[PDB]
């Protein structure tokens, strides 16, 4: 019971040829299920490394968190290796990284598991913890982030008291906006103060699905 | 005498840098002088007595810092050709060791800033003139720490060290003289300025440092000292009692015993306490 399934076939185009059998294969899952009716499978279990995907939001912050206290060397994020200076941060204490323009604010404490990146301006009094902050990151105080994410050009104002995020491009909120668990922010939210937003919400452009409009997502 | 007014003008008119350096800047500036047309006397007597001369403050740095600078020109002031141009002209050499060791206080800041471990609160000494620079060039770039001052108490001065810092935004709280010991738990690394370095390897400075030391080896943490190419001297204690009476002045000024420090930086470079010995012989051939 103790396995998990991650995409990482390696075969050999007699593979090809028995989905050149069944037109109606689709995915690896009939495949393996067309093995099963009889041209044979092993498996390989191994004691040693990490592998496996995401295409959800949910086991992204898991290998997310994975990444970050290191489940994943000699694949680490401090040699750098994609080749740029704008992923230039060195390690410290707890594994936590400090990029490029770093300044951190007086008395501003920063515990566990975290790195930024570039053009990373932080403010004094935050508090941050398990999370990744990436670049374009602009900080007021009191700023609490946990476990949350902070892609290319994001703001956020003072007092933000977040819990637990998944956040996008380019995307400001204001002041005393509380936040809670499982919920997702994407390509340019306005949200202004007061809103002590619920568990979860898809806040984006799109009308339909995501629970926002192409304007901002207090009310229409 | 005639000349010691003068250097009563460069302690007095740009405060900011040390003493010794403004004796070399004095005496180097009088070799211009009403011309004695001679090698041998001007030099080594004539400078001998000015250096007797200008050694009536309680300094220890000084003196020695006159020392050094006759070995700086002990060099190659030569014997060349004619007394044209033996050192009365060509005497740029002496110039570019005022220079070397102006610019060695900005060589300091740029080697020693790098060290200071983020998130350890660290206790100085009284004020130095190399510690404001060396914090100047950590807080530049982009740290955060603490740091506290002891008084260093004959007279206030720790209070001193907090006019310095203070007046570019940076946290300080001056603590008191006798209860270092308290607050050596919290830091966990300790930086001092010089008034000379020793043979030994120990350091002289005024009084609150041997404590700062032995507390820091009974806690088994980290004691470091800094100083610069002009505090090299060549006594030598083994128990306090044999450092000059008149570099003593109830100690105005104090030495520290050689090798409970850990590491040690100067203008030559950050070497080690035996180090000392050999990188200061390397001087004065």
Excluded at chain 1, 198 to 220: C, K, N, R, T, Y
Excluded at chain 2, 112 to 135: E, N, P
Aim: aromatic share 8%; net charge negative; hydrophobic share 40%.
């Amino acid at each position: 019971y103790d396995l998990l399934d991650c995409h990482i076939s390696i075969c050999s185009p007699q593979v090809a040829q028995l989905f050149t059998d069944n037109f109606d294969y689709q995915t690896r899952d009939d495949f393996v299920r067309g093995l099963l009716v009889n041209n044979q499978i092993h498996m390989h279990v191994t004691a040693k490394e990490y592998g496996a995907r995401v295409s959800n939001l949910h086991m992204y912050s898991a290998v997310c968190a994975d990444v970050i206290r290191r489940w994943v060397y000699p694949l680490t994020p401090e040699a750098n290796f994609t080749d740029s200076t704008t992923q230039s941060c060195t390690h410290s204490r707890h594994n936590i990284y400090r990029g490029p323009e770093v300044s951190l604010g007086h008395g501003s404490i920063l515990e566990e598991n975290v790195l930024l990146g570039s053009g990373t301006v932080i403010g004094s009094n935050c508090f941050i913890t398990n999370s990744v902050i990436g670049p374009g990151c602009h900080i007021g105080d009191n700023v609490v982030l946990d476990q949350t994410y902070l892609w290319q050009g994001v703001r956020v104002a003072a007092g933000a008291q977040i819990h637990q995020s998944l956040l996008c491009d380019n995307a400001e909120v204001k002041e005393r906006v509380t936040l809670k668990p499982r919920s997702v922010l994407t390509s340019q939210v306005v949200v202004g103060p007061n809103i002590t937003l619920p568990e979860g919400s898809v806040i984006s452009l799109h009308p339909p699905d995501a629970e926002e409009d192409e304007d901002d997502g207090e009310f229409s | 005498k005639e000349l010691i007014e003068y250097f009563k003008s460069q302690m007095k008119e740009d405060p900011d840098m040390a003493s010794a350096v403004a004796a070399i800047r004095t005496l180097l500036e009088f070799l211009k002088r009403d011309k004695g047309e001679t090698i041998q006397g001007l030099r080594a007597n004539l400078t001998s007595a000015i250096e007797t001369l200008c050694g009536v403050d309680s300094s220890v740095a000084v003196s020695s810092g006159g020392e050094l600078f006759l070995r700086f020109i002990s060099l190659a002031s030569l014997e060349y050709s004619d007394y044209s141009k033996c050192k009365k002209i060509m005497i740029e050499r002496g110039e570019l060791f005022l220079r070397r060791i102006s610019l060695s206080r900005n060589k300091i800041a740029d080697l020693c800033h790098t060290f200071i471990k983020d998130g350890a609160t660290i206790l100085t000494h009284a004020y130095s003139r190399v510690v404001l620079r060396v914090l100047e060039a950590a807080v530049a770039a982009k740290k955060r720490f603490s740091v506290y001052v002891t008084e260093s108490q004959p007279d206030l001065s720790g209070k001193k060290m907090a006019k310095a810092l203070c007046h570019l935004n940076v946290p300080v709280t001056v603590v008191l003289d006798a209860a270092v010991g308290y607050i050596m738990e919290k830091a966990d690394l300790v930086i001092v300025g010089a008034e000379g370095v020793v043979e030994n390897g120990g350091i002289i400075n005024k009084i609150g440092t041997n404590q700062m030391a032995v507390c820091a080896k009974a806690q088994n943490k980290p004691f470091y000292v800094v100083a610069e190419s002009f505090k090299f001297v060549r006594l030598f204690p083994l128990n306090q009692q044999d450092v000059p009476d008149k570099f003593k002045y109830h100690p105005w000024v104090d030495y520290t015993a050689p090798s409970l420090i850990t590491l040690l930086f100067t203008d030559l470079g950050v070497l080690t306490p035996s180090a000392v010995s050999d990188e200061l012989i390397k001087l004065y051939l």
